[model samples]
Target chain A: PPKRRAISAIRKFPRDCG
Target chain B: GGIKMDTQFYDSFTFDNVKYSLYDNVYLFKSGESEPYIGKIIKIWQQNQAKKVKILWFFLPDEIRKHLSGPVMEKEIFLACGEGVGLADINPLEAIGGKCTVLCISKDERNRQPSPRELAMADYIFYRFFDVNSCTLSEQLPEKIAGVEGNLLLNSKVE
Candidate 1:
């Protein structure tokens, strides 16, 4: 498997719409 | 490591995957290489038109995009520029109210934009290419500076 596993749950951290 | 950090962010990149990745919630466009940039359909707005785009974000690379040894914390920053693309007065400084750290304003000359190598160093790749009509549904990575320079050098030195 690749060293970097998939980001867990695509962290719902604030994504600005701008 | 001769680079200096004049702002809060200081990372460059080529493919951070902000445009095609999970953060495909915005529409980005540039007037020209140096022209200001404009972003639409962000968290602040719910429309799809460029004019309706409330925020104007500029992009910076994260750890993964920068190929650095750390976790990726990407953000699609806004830069108060203009519509999608085609302006000659594009200055990330003028648009964002802050000077560009990774992509210097001095480099926006001779009809040049951020090189792919430069973009690759970024944490997240913003989507604002000239050819918006041919939008692809999958990942799109910018060509690196070395490759572009080589192509230009080779193509320019014709017999």
Candidate 2:
């Protein structure tokens, strides 16, 4: 159900990038 | 340092070594005695030294050690031998300046390597009974008589 998992993948979202 | 460890286990032991209000209770005794010789810890150094350790509890080898039997504590490490008696007092630390703290005893403290007076005391107590493997009450006695140097915050001279 979640979109991203690893540290690299979690960066996809703009807020997540920071 | 390991990258994949769950928690920091294999890494080096890092510490600020800063002391707080905590104190260590030191005791002096022989191999197996019902009571322990006692003394309060004090600072070896007088000026600004955060990481200094001093003798806290001072006791002779008699009351605590099995080899000797008599008094519990002595004003000095000596005055206790096979024939002589040692002395001990409860709450010996209370005799130190009220605000003083205590700290852990180190190897140097146990052996009392430097001080000739203390060494003479140990020699008098150990004599022919010295055993490296054995852990006597005297051996376990804490080195710091006062608290760790930084932990005890004494008041200023002017205050």
Best by DockQ: 1
Q: What is the DockQ score of candidate 1, to 2 decimals?
A: 0.04
Q: Give me the displacement of residue B104 in model 1, in angstroms.
A: 10
lDDT of 2 by residue, B13-129 (tens): 112232223232233332333443333333322223223323333333432355433443332242111111121122211222222212222243233223444334332222121
The per-model lDDT (C-alpha) reads 0.25, 0.26
Score every model by TM-score: 0.18, 0.20
What TM-score does model 2 achieve against the real structure? 0.20
For candidate 1, lDDT tens digit of each residue in A1-18? 011212211111122211
CA lDDT of B139 in candidate 1?
21
| RMSD of candidate 1 to true structure, Å | 18.3
